[PDB]
């Protein structure tokens, strides 16, 4: 559980942790709840209650995350100092990053209470799935949910070129690492730290990017098989649980990859600032 | 979301037609755009369906071979191609989205595709000057093909309006009348304009009927 | 593939009545029956989806019922705005969009007298050598009406006489438009023109002249 949290610093003076399994899990039951109310035409009105329930689930989950905020900002203020013109500052960062993660681990059951509250609500609606003939079930729920909740995201992802967005950052890290070698100085220390944090950010962007590319295709393939059909009630439920899984896996990796994209370029903005100082105002 | 089709058209017999249908969403998603035609008297007749996410079209036995349904995802428009037309094909062609209710949820406005060798002549608009209330109207004469859309006071006047169906003359051109009843009080106090619209000949008349 | 025998073809029921349209099937259709209200000019509107579900915004009077081979459509209270042709249909995922024959619901209401009005050819059209006269009968019932054109007493018959169809209204009333189109050469030749209207409401057949 300790190696499944991602840190995001989108703006210079920002920090946010994302518990990858928690976010995937809560998203899995968001799709399950929606599919459940949208299969039966009569249960469409439930959408208001489900919307306002998921609202308070995100609200209550974020109220737990905020308990670590005092530690979070203590770490932000250390990063803020570390990027500007070192042994004690590096250990100041380590002890605070490890302290913030421990804070999160202390609320393990406090987040899983919100998770279990969601799992129970989504399963409660899912068990209320009603078919006219349990042999010939309709795939209308899968279509309204895909059209109004998933297709938009797929087209948004297909619009951007994530393989290009990776090839951009390989060139950036190629030129920063190349300049670092030529630099033969306390500036070199802070530049080697930003370059190291970005190098191990590109890995997270590349990782999430593979998930997005493969889930995009695997969702577009499975959605052609689950719509305009008359499924057996058992196979219908199994295919809803199948879809909600691919949807949860895709959304989580897209949400994180876009946070990681802004995170890489916000810190790359400050890497080129130190270059403009170490050379222009120094030589 | 809304489906917008092309305006009416006269097509020469033996020719092909192409009725458009733009979706107001950006993409067709997992929608099924269906084409259903209404013949002169005959009831609704399903022709075909296209599921753009699938990439396959399905036609009725009657229309397999002549009809071809295409869909441009670049503009999110679905077209119906009725090739080698004959007089029988003169009908209103409709659009439909197979909605989440398992039925035709969104419908297009219709396209009056007429199959004739004659050409599009615009309408002539003459007034019907009034003689205990008082009626007045617009005479739309000698126009081909159907239809003509006549409104009163640019839409505002609706109560009392009787737009008559076009009767086809011995000449070969339609001729409708759009009467409306107003009181003898606002006869000289209120302004009355009929807004004729023959779309196949791009005509848009704004006649001022006076007593 | 699955024949949809929808009955009756026509229906002349009065206002504040109950109307029952029926749709049949050559095979078993579980719950795939869609009922539509096709208004003239207007595109067909979907009223009942999947045999019984009222479409969002369709009055409660309308109600789809039944399943299997026999399905029903019920309008609790006939309203003047419910005059239109009603169809049934089925979907089978094959695909199979078979359609119903069509029930034309026309209201049989109170006997009304026509509002006979005569319209002379406008001077704008007379300038172009044409002279089309118009006789208008407004808000009448029954839709059965006879209008004769007497050009200077003489009953001109074959000449024009294009009686335009009756637009059924949300007042449960009709309207006719007989038009005597002729050349201005024959129009200036005579001075008096009239339309002899005969109707079930008109006890004494009235005539409007000029």
Residue numbers in the entry:
A (entry chain A): 157 to 241, 300 to 398, 404 to 502
B (entry chain B): 2 to 132, 139 to 218
C (entry chain C): 1 to 210
What's the publication's text?
This complex was initially found to be composed of reticulocyte-binding protein homolog 5 (RH5), cysteine-rich protective antigen (CyRPA), and RH5-interacting protein (RIPR). RH5 plays an indispensable role in mediating merozoite invasion by binding the erythrocyte surface protein basigin.
To enable a comparison with MAD8–502 and MAD8–151, we next determined the structures of vaccine-derived antibodies MAD10–466 and MAD10-255 bound to RH5 using Fab or scFv fragments, respectively, to enable crystallization. (E) Top and side views of the crystal structure of MAD10–466 Fab fragment (light blue) bound to RH5 (yellow). MAD8–502 used the same VH gene (IGHV1–69), targeted the same epitope (bin I), and had similar potency to vaccine-derived MAD10–466. In the case of the MAD8–502 and MAD10–466 pair, binding similarity is predominantly within their heavy chains, where interactions made by CDRs H1 and H2 to RH5 are conserved. These CDRs are encoded by the IGHV1-69 gene, which the mAbs share, and utilize a conserved hydrophobic patch in CDR H2 (residues I52, I54, and F/L55) to bind RH5. Although CDRs H3 in both antibodies make several hydrophobic and hydrogen bond interactions with RH5, and share an interaction with R357 of RH5, these occur due to different residues, reflecting differences in gene usage and amino acid sequences despite their CDRs being similar lengths. Indeed, MAD10–466 binds more intimately with RH5 than MAD8–502, with the light chain variable domain rotated slightly toward RH5, enabling CDRs L1 to L3 to make contacts.
